[PDB]
Design a protein around this nucleic acid. Structure first.
Ligand code: K
Ligand code: MG
Ligand code: MG
Ligand code: MG
Ligand code: MG
Lengths: 92, 74, 48, 143, 354, 95, 52, 49, 31
RNA sequence: UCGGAGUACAAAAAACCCUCCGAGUGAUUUUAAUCUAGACAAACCAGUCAAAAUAACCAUAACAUCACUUAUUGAUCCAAAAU
């Protein structure tokens, strides 16, 4: 990802921020497909998936948001752990 | 037979299992829904020393919900 | 042929009886293993 | 190779709450002809005896996890009477704090229809909502 | 062919005759209380508790812990009543109680709950989460002494660790601080272990911290055996349980056989068995406290595998069993057209000789 | 069924079968449920769905319809944009 | 007393008609059905009489 | 099958291949009477072509 | 079931009275 | 022709120009969707239930109800209506 010079600098770092789960230890971005039996279609799917990753990360104004069922409980469990965090006394 | 654990109930009062497992039959106590006027009236008139008993059909699950497998080691 | 059947039937009954005795001893030996494997109960015995 | 890189193909997690916290564990669906429905992970059991107020949080196995009742000497010496509307509020607030300390953030409360309109129970749930504990357990994933 | 019941029938005690003399229930909340009390008795017939995993029913729990403090009930009964009369006589309390406008000092109740019934409430929390099952098997202990574990996250913010709480690994990156009341006449041992998370072995647990021979309250002054390591749960399997164990020891014990190297990063050296560990020093140590929290995966876990452990990060996933289908019949009878799709191997059409 | 015709002497077919049945190359026949257009307001939502579904025929019905039609309708056909083209061949049948 | 069967057409413009049994002495009926074409509940009004 | 025909000399890529050359190579059989309008190319062996 | 020892565990009609319903034609205060 | 009770005493099935009750629809609004695992029933044609998933609406909402609720019903072709 670091040495991929066919993408812009703001686009290169936004890929690392959003897709940090797919980044290998050595900085190698890994994309995998399993849809079709023919490897021509599998490679075509990876390229189309890579285009979508770059296209949405390229646009600075592209920042979509969404609400999910797991998002509700994630917000609640995050809010609940902040209740105990509110105390402020000298630490170790 | 009243439905029990992991056993549904159709509109025609048929009992169907909801989970894969072993069918078991059991005698348990009966606590009717308060919105059922006829059933709650029967419970009201019972003497203090008595409790309703009914038969139930259970299905103890056998297969676990799922297992964790290694899909990728980055 | 009849004599061989008598010997076969006599041995299977005897062999089956031996297996039951082994399980009874095995069950008892396993019970004493649990007693001699747990931890010394401190509990209220510390103050007792 | 690297002796530290050895990983078993299948990982066994022995934590009983792992599936419950992931919303993938099995809910005991069924019954319907009896009440209350036993389709939950944690149930709030409120018992109003003529002398004391007791609130329990129970697992589907029948065990009680966290309990806050006026019979405790800790709460008894701070309340005027153990059978008031205020006493229910104190029980609700104390239990709400303990549930957060115990990590239980979701539970199911199935009140009797006349208890749902009762003044004490109505304000008891208000303490729970502001106490951080949220009713209406999340729906099971792939139920 | 009628058979004889094996025991007393449920409703045979009451007399069928003279129904009017027997007092009725007259309520629905009385029956529920009566039914639930009846549902927990060990009936001779098949019951729900028998088939649905009551955990061997009655269990002879082995108690290995400090004895409960000696308290005189006779004196306690009088003083508790005497204190209540002073509060009862207060007219201003009656003014607030009647008007439904009063609050309580939750912090004061928290302090007293820990001293009076905290150890017993924490015992069932551990039993519910199975801490005793995976550490002492059937044996259990009462957390008699209070124990406080807190993590320094911000400049002054302090994340607490209660029984069964949830802590993100980022808050747990640094070592925590432990505070407990004890006189300078004994020694204590602190142990932090990851009950689930061992990779090769499923019945073993990792060790993240181990301090030996702690003089009184000051944990830092105690001898250090295993250095602190941030929690590293796997990305796929989440919610690992980390438990703090406090042991009270009579004599200075030689905890040198369990010594770990200083920059210890080999997970094969972190393999631990608490039951085996407590077996060796059962005579000297005695469990006294407990505090455990849940922990899931976050971004701070990744750097632990790379920078610290020099390990490629493993990622798991929750995989469900495949769906069940009946044996395929040559001529399906009154079945939908999609009956063939269930047994299809792949949706890509496959041509043969053509 | 005319086993031997009077003009060419071959075996004729019954046009009633072809107008209301579909034969897959695996031997299975396809048909519509009876009564899927009659009195829809009377039937429930589930019943209407069941009547609108294609169903298979058992061995006796399948064997009966093979002796009523000639060998032209049992051939392998490669239609363009045929929805049933993927259902022609059986797969993973362990008999 | 005999009932009448009437066909109700959607007021959302889409072509969707479901028949409903109605009492004869009652006036024109107007319901709130749910047409899958728009995937939203829309007003339905009585249009034609088919069967008695 | 197209790869199979070429390897065995049934058809040759030096000369242009059309429907007539396939028939002479016994690759496909076309029955005009049974409403056959030609040969369609499918992608069953695209990976090893 | 009849042959099982747990037969008649659900018997309740002998606990409550018959409670004769007030029939439309038989409605009368028979004291 | 269709349903309920007895004959058919305890899983299912089981007959008579056998003994007794009914049905060939009303009332009301909660106007009741789409798609699919697995099964009961059955010579065939028919009949029944149904998780998950999607949409509808408390913004993580599917059993129309009551009258012994069980029966309240009719296959192709063909005809008419918007399809
Ligand atoms: K583990
Ligand atoms: Mg041909
Ligand atoms: Mg069958
Ligand atoms: Mg559903
Ligand atoms: Mg005809």
């Amino acid at each position: 990802l670091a040495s991929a010079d066919w993408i812009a600098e703001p686009v290169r770092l936004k890929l690392a921020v959003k897709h940090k789960n797919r980044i290998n230890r050595s900085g190698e971005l890994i994309l995998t497909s399993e849809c079709s039996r023919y490897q021509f279609r599998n490679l075509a799917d990876c390229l189309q998936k890579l285009r979508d990753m770059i296209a949405e990360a390229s646009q600075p104004a592209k920042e979509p948001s969404r609400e999910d069922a797991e998002l509700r409980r994630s917000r609640i469990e995050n809010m609940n752990r902040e209740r105990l965090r509110k105390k402020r006394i000298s630490s170790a | 037979w009243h439905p029990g654990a992991h056993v549904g109930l159709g509109k025609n009062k048929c009992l169907y299992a909801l989970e894969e497992g072993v069918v078991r039959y059991t005698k348990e106590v009966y606590v009717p829904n308060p919105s059922n006027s006829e059933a709650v009236d029967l419970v009201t008139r019972l003497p203090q020393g008595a409790v309703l008993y009914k038969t139930f059909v259970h299905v103890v699950p056998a297969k676990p919900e799922g297992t964790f497998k290694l899909v990728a080691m980055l | 042929k009849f004599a061989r059947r008598v010997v076969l039937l006599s041995q299977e009954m005897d062999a089956g009886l031996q297996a039951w005795q082994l399980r009874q001893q095995e069950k008892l030996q396993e019970e004493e293993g649990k007693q001699k494997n747990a931890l010394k109960s401190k509990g209220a015995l510390l103050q007792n | 190779p690297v002796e530290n890189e050895a990983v078993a193909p299948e990982f066994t997690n022995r934590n009983p709450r792992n599936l419950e916290l992931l919303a993938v564990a099995r809910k005991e669906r069924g019954w319907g002809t009896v009440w209350p429905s036993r389709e939950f992970w944690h149930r709030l059991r409120v018992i109003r005896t003529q002398h004391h107020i007791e609130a329990l949080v129970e697992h589907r196995n029948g065990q009680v996890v966290v309990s806050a009742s006026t019979r405790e000497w800790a709460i008894k010496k701070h309340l005027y009477s153990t059978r008031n509307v205020v006493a229910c509020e104190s029980v609700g607030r104390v239990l709400a704090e303990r549930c957060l300390e115990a990590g239980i953030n979701f539970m199911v409360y199935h009140p009797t229809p006349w208890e749902a309109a009762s003044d004490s129970i109505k304000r008891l749930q208000h303490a729970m909502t502001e106490g951080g504990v949220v009713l209406r357990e999340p729906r099971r994933i792939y139920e | 062919r009628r058979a004889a019941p094996l025991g007393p029938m449920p409703n045979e005690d009451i007399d069928v005759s003279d129904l009017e003399r027997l007092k009725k229930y007259r309520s629905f909340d009385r029956y529920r209380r009566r039914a639930e009390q009846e549902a927990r008795k060990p009936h001779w017939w098949r019951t729900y508790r028998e088939h649905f995993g009551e955990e061997s029913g009655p269990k002879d729990r082995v108690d290995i812990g400090l004895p409960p403090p000696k308290v005189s009930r006779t004196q306690q009964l009088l003083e508790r009543k005497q204190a209540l009369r002073e509060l009862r006589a207060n007219v201003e309390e009656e003014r607030a109680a009647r008007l439904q406008t009063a609050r309580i000092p939750l912090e004061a109740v928290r302090a007293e709950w820990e001293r009076t019934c905290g150890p017993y409430h924490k015992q069932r929390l551990a039993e519910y989460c199975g801490l005793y099952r995976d550490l002492f098997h059937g044996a259990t202990f009462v957390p008699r002494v209070p124990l406080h574990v807190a993590y320094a996250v911000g400049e002054d913010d302090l994340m607490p660790v209660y029984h069964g709480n949830e802590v993100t690994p980022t808050e747990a990156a640094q070592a925590p601080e432990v505070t407990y009341e004890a006189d300078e006449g004994s020694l204590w041992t602190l142990l932090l272990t990851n009950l689930d998370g061992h990779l090769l072995e499923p019945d073993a647990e990792y060790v993240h911290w181990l301090v030996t021979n702690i003089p009184g309250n000051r944990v830092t002054e105690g001898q250090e055996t295993c250095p602190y390591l941030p929690p590293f749960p796997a990305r796929g399997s989440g919610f690992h349980r980390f438990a703090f164990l406090l042991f009270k020891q009579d004599k200075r014990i030689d905890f040198s056989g369990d010594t770990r190297p200083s920059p210890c990063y080999q997970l094969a050296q972190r393999t631990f068995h608490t039951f085996d560990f407590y077996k060796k020093h059962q005579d000297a140590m005695t469990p006294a406290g407990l505090a455990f929290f849940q922990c899931r995966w976050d971004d701070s876990v990744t750097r632990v595998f790379h920078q610290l452990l020099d390990m490629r990060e493993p990622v798991f996933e929750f995989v469900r069993p495949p769906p069940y289908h009946p044996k395929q019949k040559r001529f399906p009878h009154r079945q939908p057209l999609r009956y063939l799709d269930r047994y299809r191997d792949s949706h890509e059409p496959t041509y043969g000789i053509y | 069924v005319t086993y031997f015709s009077s003009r060419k002497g071959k075996r004729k077919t019954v046009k009633a079968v072809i107008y209301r049945f579909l034969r897959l190359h695996s031997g299975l026949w396809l048909r519509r449920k009876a009564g899927y257009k009659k009195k829809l307001w009377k039937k429930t939502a589930a019943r209407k769905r069941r009547l609108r579904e294609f169903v298979f025929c058992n061995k006796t019905q399948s064997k009966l319809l093979d002796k009523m039609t000639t060998s032209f309708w049992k051939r392998r056909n490669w239609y363009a944009d045929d929805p049933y083209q993927k259902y022609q061949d059986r797969t993973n049948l362990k008999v | 007393s005999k009932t009448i069967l009437v066909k109700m057409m959607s007021q959302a413009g889409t072509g969707f008609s479901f028949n409903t049994k109605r009492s004869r002495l009652r006036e024109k009926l107007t319901l709130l059905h749910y047409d899958p074409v728009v995937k939203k509940k829309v007003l339905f009004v009585e249009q034609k009489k088919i069967r008695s | 099958r197209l790869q199979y025909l070429i390897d065995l000399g049934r058809v040759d890529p030096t000369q242009p291949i059309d429907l007539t050359q396939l028939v002479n190579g016994r690759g496909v059989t076309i029955q005009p009477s049974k409403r056959d309008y030609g040969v369609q190319l499918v992608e069953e062996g695209a990976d090893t072509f | 079931y009849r042959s099982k020892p747990t037969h008649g565990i659900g018997r309740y009609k002998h606990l409550v009275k018959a409670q004769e319903p007030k029939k439309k034609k038989g409605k009368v205060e028979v004291r």
